[PDB]
Structure 1
Amino acid sequence: SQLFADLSREELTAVMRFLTQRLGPGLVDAAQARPSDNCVFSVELQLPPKAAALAHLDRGSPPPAREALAIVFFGRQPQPNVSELVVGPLPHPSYMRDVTVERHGGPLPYHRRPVLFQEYLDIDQMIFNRELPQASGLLHHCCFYKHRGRNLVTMTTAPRGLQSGDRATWFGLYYNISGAGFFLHHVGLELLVNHKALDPARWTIQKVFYQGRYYDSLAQLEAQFEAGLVNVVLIPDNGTGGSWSLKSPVPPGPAPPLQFYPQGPRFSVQGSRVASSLWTFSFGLGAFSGPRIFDVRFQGERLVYEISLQEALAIYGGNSPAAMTTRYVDGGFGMGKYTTPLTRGVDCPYLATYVDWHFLLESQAPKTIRDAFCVFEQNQGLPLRRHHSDLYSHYFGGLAETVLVVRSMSTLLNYDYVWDTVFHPSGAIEIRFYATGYISSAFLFGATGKYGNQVSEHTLGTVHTHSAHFKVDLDVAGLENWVWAEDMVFVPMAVPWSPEHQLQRLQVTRKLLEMEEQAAFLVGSATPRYLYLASNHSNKWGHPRGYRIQMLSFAGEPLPQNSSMARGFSWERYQLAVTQRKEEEPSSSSVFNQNDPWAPTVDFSDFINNETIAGKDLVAWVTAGFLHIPHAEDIPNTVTVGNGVGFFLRPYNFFDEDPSFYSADSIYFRGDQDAGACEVNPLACLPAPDLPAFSHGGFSH
């Protein structure tokens, strides 16, 4: 690995040592920080400048300094802010730059900071010790309440309030189900907690919700109940089935099919670079933005500088305040931070290579997520190509598709997002995103038809949309790229020969798109059938070397623009956009957007601003998603079938012929040959497997 490798535990420790020195002892461990402390919230790789980086990979120039970016919580002060500090060079840091205002134009308001885990503990303490017992009347008759046992548990929602500067979060209450998902057991109560004060003692409950009704306080509710004005119904807290359990009641049977490598792995993983005979690339995770791939070279030629997840978004509907106002912008929690171990043989093939990831977040020392990535070759059991000739000449030639895959999974509370990077031997790249895990349920009460389906006894599966944003820094045969839109048209013409007759003449249409706005495509509008970035260079046949972007999405209608918060994820409105790549436009979102979408720290629509994309270094931005109306078959989990979205990058006249023609694994034989002869056909030479003992990456405390 090297240039793009996430920071090592060693490097992380070094950056933290350096930070503990240059900041005013009285710096607290973020894992215990109160709002008014100072705090290292995160430390992670700071990605090199593109120009320096290429200089080093393509033209011998030495590597750009290796730096970290640290996000610090400055609450021990008259005007608290959040600061972004670059720290470097590594491995032995000597400087520390504050880029906060360079990037943002001013300080970062302190309410934009992510809720810390200690902040959650404190909210819980407030709820469970000071607020809930005031309703131990009601809660005994609906939800088996006790002392503080407790049987209940809370889950956060979306943005936290109704306008910039708010930090008030709606929480639902849930049975603390054991060994299975609590998410399906909303007990009916929702609390609007205002935790904006830096003194958690000034924290208040602004609103309460129970069975379709609102109250200004729990005591108010508890009173309405003692007055016999609130019909209570005792919600069971145990059960059987998928609703209550994830473990299967059926004895295991004969094993599922297993793939192995007869003559060993055909790719290697060194640090965080992957090389096969066809592909080399580096991979990693942003703490906040998650999966990323750099420096992808097919057969030594670079196709893409960067492909990375930008953001993941979930917009809910509901019967209830928590659900009806939820809009998660998941980078506010962090796709890398919340990445989880892969279970060997379930999350990936048993014989995949599994790699660890290290991080420093909300603590003062490095921690490791074991088995966070997997890399493997997968025989797709589908041919890449084949032709069987019975006509004029008797031959067969084809090649079975084997694919190279990098994967990790982020578990954002209930959801488990699966991120796939798939390298094809045709020179196509496939980026996929699947959502499994648990749905968010609401408590089923009142008229629920317009907001979801009943999916269990007391469980409303609430309607929502999922979407995700991808950065695609194609460098098609260099940096200077154009974008083409090709498509088709019928044109009625007379038949040349028989001009009395007509015919619909099918024609290709091509259009160069020269301005950003011309290549920004809104969800809901139609897009050209062929859409690619090209070089001015041509292939042997004189067509522009191109890579075409083909989208797999079933986009739901994006949050309408009139929303005060919509600019916190404006990329949701576009399917495809292509901009000039700028060093000051590294992401389309930010960890800070989540807690203030009303005053977005980054607003994607800014990137589309009347510049030229004709012969420039272009980056393309892809949105993919779908509507989800949960249904009974989402219990216990939603399945991955049919729910993969993303895109293909496919060569389009980039090469002079299909590269797989030169494949070591292709098969060919003529009728006149002995197809069963080892020399004619390597399929005829075929041919303990050796399984590593099973280990699991464990859990986090």
Structure 2
Amino acid sequence: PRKAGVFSDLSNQELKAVHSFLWSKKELRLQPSSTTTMAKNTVFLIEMLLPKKYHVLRFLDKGERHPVREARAVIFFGDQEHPNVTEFAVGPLPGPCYMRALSPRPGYQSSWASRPISTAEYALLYHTLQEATKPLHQFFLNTTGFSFQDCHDRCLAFTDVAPRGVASGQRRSWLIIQRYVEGYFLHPTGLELLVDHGSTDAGHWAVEQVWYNGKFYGSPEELARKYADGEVDVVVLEDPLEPPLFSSHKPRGDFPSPIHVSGPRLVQPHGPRFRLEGNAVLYGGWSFAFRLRSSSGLQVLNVHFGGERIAYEVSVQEAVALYGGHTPAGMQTKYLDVGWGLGSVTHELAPGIDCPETATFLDTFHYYDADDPVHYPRALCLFEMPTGVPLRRHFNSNFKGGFNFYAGLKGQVLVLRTTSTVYNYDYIWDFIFYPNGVMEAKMHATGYVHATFYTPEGLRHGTRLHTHLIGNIHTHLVHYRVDLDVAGTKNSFQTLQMKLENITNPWSPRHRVVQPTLEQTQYSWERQAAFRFKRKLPKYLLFTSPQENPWGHKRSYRLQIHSMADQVLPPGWQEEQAITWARYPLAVTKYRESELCSSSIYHQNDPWDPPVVFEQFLHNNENIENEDLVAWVTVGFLHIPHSEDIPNTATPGNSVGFLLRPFNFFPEDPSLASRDTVIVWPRDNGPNYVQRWIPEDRDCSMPPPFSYNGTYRPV
């Protein structure tokens, strides 16, 4: 269990140790992230940097030494003539002595433009807007009752969309202006503004274009003028500030059948049945470690069942929302969430709501756009829950008014969960473990939709959800890395299909038997195992070991994809270079340390020329027979918003993911070791014998009272 520490995130202490070491190098001229100038040197991100798999596996499987522990440190070098972003690996931990180059990209010049936005930058943007929009002040008051200057409880706000321009190196953002009320995401005013904020001197920043209610205007002054001269068809918004605001979660309406009491709840009188210690988990047959990468999010590592490895890594790689729109902001929006620290917006899970009251809730620390490491309460939870459906059951009838036996095993699952709330949407990320060796990855979508100001032309790109509101059409796409090591590193990939044959009926020569047969297809090269959305995806996608089970069949795990995704952008066109993985519901690559990730934090702001292009992993078309393979999986769905998305998108029917299922891996059902199985047997002239291996439970316990903090701060 101490071995799982190799996969563990950095502690508050280690984050501080790395930050202090960076600050001790006076030549870096490092300033705090909150300093409100772009022309500064700052440490933007610090997170644990996984050691090489070769070394980890020798540590884990061969008794060799613990690999050196390091942190990734991303430094924004704004305080120089040619600003750039450079990454380092800082180590060792404990006792940092060195910073070495990490992911160097020599000859690329747009790193500064590619960098994530930051709190300091937002503050300066708000300053830029307050000055630049002064001509529109009276316009603001007349059309909205809110303002940017001299506001207190009636402030305008903005939401920036990305990417930021039409080509690599640009940092020109469209901004959707909204009223800052409860659920402000759903309150666009009809104004959108394009700001060039590329220069490290914010005094050079300019609103270069203005869109209001269907027309472009060139500058704030021009719109002000034309409005003053009565030449603008404006939409005067009603006052927002008894009934709840449409964008509030507050209850309204009544069901015809009143519900006055709390619903059923999980109790756990015996406590957890899994063993969670640090980042190590044991649960029946299962053994795995986890981590929460601040940049990209949740990972489960070194996953075993039955004491045998199944997967070295399963991890979220990227999550995107690709929009169409009638407004410039809407037609600009391709959100890539790793560009926003998908793994560090893991905000507090509410006990009894976000996870069961019986869950184990876990804190973490993140250092992402911060002056010090920040404590995130209840960032993750781990819990066992009844699925409501038995894992297996059978009624063995005697067909004479009775039975020979009933047998059943109550359905339970272990769930590891976190969330990501960057801004409007809340994604819920689950890794789920079933007692029979099946594991499942799942994303659910909830929170607020990305929405723009209603005009009639908007109906070609979305749905009217309220008086002044359009929910823009978009597609959610998530990419997963699935480094399966089925019973070991060396695997192959094959598929199975049903194929009909047409033979002479062997017992009636005058007749035919047209019937299913089992067809196996082997795959030798990466390109053969790169399935595009147009291609027919076989029903059995198997990752196999050369080892056979006792019945002569190769030991395999099957990948089963649950998705409504499709090709969204045209392959090869401009920003689509950022998301070439989204060409493939499944693609298989040969493992490589230079190919651990399909995305990065830089992809959002330079989608034209990003540091990783997944398609390039397929270029060399490597042999994949008896090799360390990585499966990569795209899942997602088209979301055409509808009125039921107000105030929030709901989770029912809004999840996607995949299952990993053993297929001839174990000699028989691996859940047979469960002692929860019950078999009822008849007895002549008596009550039935209920055979158990664990006593019947009716015990009771109570969860702690509900609490919720809502703050996240350094400790």
Q: Report if TM-score (shorter chain) is over 0.5.
A: yes
Give unpaired runs (5+ residues) of structure 2: none
Aligned residue in 2 for 1:699: 711
Query: Residues 350 and 105 of structure 1: is their aligned pair in 2 closer, same or farther, counting only changes over 3 Å?
Result: farther
Deviation string 1:153-204 (CA, Å, 9 cap, x unpaired) is 1111020000111100101011101xx3111111110001100011011001
CA shift for structure 1 position 222: 1.1
Aligned residue in 2 for 1:96: 99
Q: Secondary structure at the match of 1:221?
A: helix
Q: Secondary structure at the match of 1:24?
A: helix
The CA distance in 2 between the partners of 1:594 and 1:286, in whole Å, is 18
Does structure 2 conserve the Cα–Cα contact (< 8 Å) formed by 1:37 and 1:74? Answer: yes
- Do residues 196 (structure 1) and 206 (structure 2) align? no
Aligned residue in 2 for 1:238: 240
Q: Secondary structure at the match of 1:2?
A: helix
Q: Secondary structure at the match of 1:534?
A: strand
The CA distance in 1 between the partners of 2:110 and 2:89, in whole Å, is 15
Does structure 1 conserve the Cα–Cα contact (< 8 Å) formed by 2:295 and 2:338? Answer: yes
Deviation string 1:430-460 (CA, Å, 9 cap, x unpaired) is 0000110000111111323211111111111
- Do residues 668 (structure 1) and 670 (structure 2) align? no
| Percent sequence identity over aligned pairs | 40
The CA distance in 2 between the partners of 1:425 and 1:199, in whole Å, is 58
Aligned residue in 2 for 1:583: 593
- Do residues 540 (structure 1) and 543 (structure 2) align? no
Query: Residues 564 and 675 of structure 1: is their aligned pair in 2 closer, same or farther, counting only changes over 3 Å?
Result: farther
Q: Secondary structure at the match of 1:136?
A: helix
Deviation string 1:131-153 (CA, Å, 9 cap, x unpaired) is 22211232222111344315211
Match of 1:608 among 618, 621, 625: 618
Query: Residues 66 and 108 of structure 1: is their aligned pair in 2 closer, same or farther, counting only changes over 3 Å?
Result: farther
Query: Residues 136 and 107 of structure 1: is their aligned pair in 2 closer, same or farther, counting only changes over 3 Å?
Result: closer
Aligned residue in 2 for 1:352: 359
Does structure 2 conserve the Cα–Cα contact (< 8 Å) formed by 1:212 and 1:446? Answer: no
The CA distance in 2 between the partners of 1:575 and 1:17, in whole Å, is 43
Q: How do residues 222-621 of structure 1 correspond to structure 2 at under 5 angstroms?
A: 222-238=224-240, 240-241=243-244, 243-249=246-252, 253-391=260-398, 394-609=404-619, 610-621=621-632
CA shift for structure 1 position 269: 1.7
Query: Residues 9 and 99 of structure 1: is their aligned pair in 2 closer, same or farther, counting only changes over 3 Å?
Result: same
The CA distance in 2 between the partners of 1:524 and 1:151, in whole Å, is 48
What letter is aligned with 2:184?
Answer: F
Greater mean deviation of Cα atoms: 667-676 or 611-620: 667-676
Q: Secondary structure at the match of 2:177?
A: strand
What letter is aligned with 1:477?
Answer: A
Greater mean deviation of Cα atoms: 147-156 or 45-54: 147-156
The CA distance in 2 between the partners of 1:496 and 1:679, in whole Å, is 46
What letter is aligned with 1:529?
Answer: K
Deviation string 1:287-330 (CA, Å, 9 cap, x unpaired) is 11111111111132211110100000010011100011100011
CA shift for structure 1 position 252: 8.0
Aligned residue in 2 for 1:109: 111
Deviation string 1:612-648 (CA, Å, 9 cap, x unpaired) is 1110000100000000011010011110001110000
Deviation string 1:188-243 (CA, Å, 9 cap, x unpaired) is 10001100011011001111100110121111111111221111221124174462
Query: Residues 677 and 506 of structure 1: is their aligned pair in 2 closer, same or farther, counting only changes over 3 Å?
Result: closer
Aligned residue in 2 for 1:139: 140
The CA distance in 1 between the partners of 2:699 and 2:348, in whole Å, is 35
Query: Residues 647 and 52 of structure 1: is their aligned pair in 2 closer, same or farther, counting only changes over 3 Å?
Result: same
Deviation string 1:383-439 (CA, Å, 9 cap, x unpaired) is 111111114771111211110010001002100000000001110110000110000
What letter is aligned with 1:48?
Answer: P
Greater mean deviation of Cα atoms: 243-252 or 292-301: 243-252
The CA distance in 1 between the partners of 2:562 and 2:666, in whole Å, is 24
CA shift for structure 1 position 351: 1.0
Q: Secondary structure at the match of 2:290?
A: strand
Query: Residues 163 and 635 of structure 1: is their aligned pair in 2 closer, same or farther, counting only changes over 3 Å?
Result: same
Does structure 2 conserve the Cα–Cα contact (< 8 Å) formed by 1:142 and 1:233? Answer: yes
Query: Residues 667 and 679 of structure 1: is their aligned pair in 2 closer, same or farther, counting only changes over 3 Å?
Result: closer
Question: TM (normalized to structure 2)?
Answer: 0.94
The CA distance in 1 between the partners of 2:458 and 2:218, in whole Å, is 24
The CA distance in 2 between the partners of 1:628 and 1:145, in whole Å, is 31
Q: Secondary structure at the match of 1:256?
A: coil
Aligned residue in 1 for 2:25: 22
The CA distance in 1 between the partners of 2:504 and 2:208, in whole Å, is 74
Q: Secondary structure at the match of 1:412?
A: coil
CA shift for structure 1 position 48: 1.1
Deviation string 1:312-370 (CA, Å, 9 cap, x unpaired) is 00100111000111000110001112121101111000110000011112223211110
What letter is aligned with 2:607?
Answer: P
The CA distance in 1 between the partners of 2:28 and 2:458, in whole Å, is 54
Query: Residues 115 and 675 of structure 1: is their aligned pair in 2 closer, same or farther, counting only changes over 3 Å?
Result: farther
- Do residues 42 (structure 1) and 54 (structure 2) align? no
- Do residues 169 (structure 1) and 173 (structure 2) align? yes
Query: Residues 601 and 108 of structure 1: is their aligned pair in 2 closer, same or farther, counting only changes over 3 Å?
Result: same
CA shift for structure 1 position 675: 6.7
Deviation string 1:460-510 (CA, Å, 9 cap, x unpaired) is 111100010000011001111000111111122221122222232211111
Deviation string 1:641-693 (CA, Å, 9 cap, x unpaired) is 01110000000101111111221111112223877656657575645413123
Deviation string 1:49-105 (CA, Å, 9 cap, x unpaired) is 10100111111101100100100011222222211100001011111111242x666
Q: Secondary structure at the match of 1:13?
A: helix
What letter is aligned with 1:303?
Answer: I
Give unpaired runs (5+ residues) of structure 1: none
Greater mean deviation of Cα atoms: 265-274 or 140-149: 140-149
What letter is aligned with 1:353?
Answer: T
The CA distance in 2 between the partners of 1:687 and 1:532, in whole Å, is 43
Does structure 1 conserve the Cα–Cα contact (< 8 Å) formed by 2:680 and 2:690? Answer: no
The CA distance in 2 between the partners of 1:116 and 1:687, in whole Å, is 51
CA shift for structure 1 position 272: 1.4
The CA distance in 2 between the partners of 1:62 and 1:343, in whole Å, is 40
Query: Residues 69 and 3 of structure 1: is their aligned pair in 2 closer, same or farther, counting only changes over 3 Å?
Result: same
Does structure 1 conserve the Cα–Cα contact (< 8 Å) formed by 2:38 and 2:120? Answer: no
CA shift for structure 1 position 557: 3.4
Q: Secondary structure at the match of 1:331?
A: helix
CA shift for structure 1 position 278: 2.3
The CA distance in 2 between the partners of 1:684 and 1:167, in whole Å, is 64
The CA distance in 2 between the partners of 1:373 and 1:629, in whole Å, is 30
Query: Residues 85 and 23 of structure 1: is their aligned pair in 2 closer, same or farther, counting only changes over 3 Å?
Result: farther
Query: Residues 491 and 196 of structure 1: is their aligned pair in 2 closer, same or farther, counting only changes over 3 Å?
Result: same
- Do residues 634 (structure 1) and 645 (structure 2) align? yes
CA shift for structure 1 position 561: 1.9
CA shift for structure 1 position 275: 1.7
Does structure 2 conserve the Cα–Cα contact (< 8 Å) formed by 1:423 and 1:429? Answer: yes
The CA distance in 2 between the partners of 1:40 and 1:681, in whole Å, is 56
Does structure 1 conserve the Cα–Cα contact (< 8 Å) formed by 2:110 and 2:169? Answer: no
The CA distance in 2 between the partners of 1:99 and 1:114, in whole Å, is 18
Does structure 2 conserve the Cα–Cα contact (< 8 Å) formed by 1:285 and 1:292? Answer: yes
Match of 1:154 among 155, 158, 183: 158
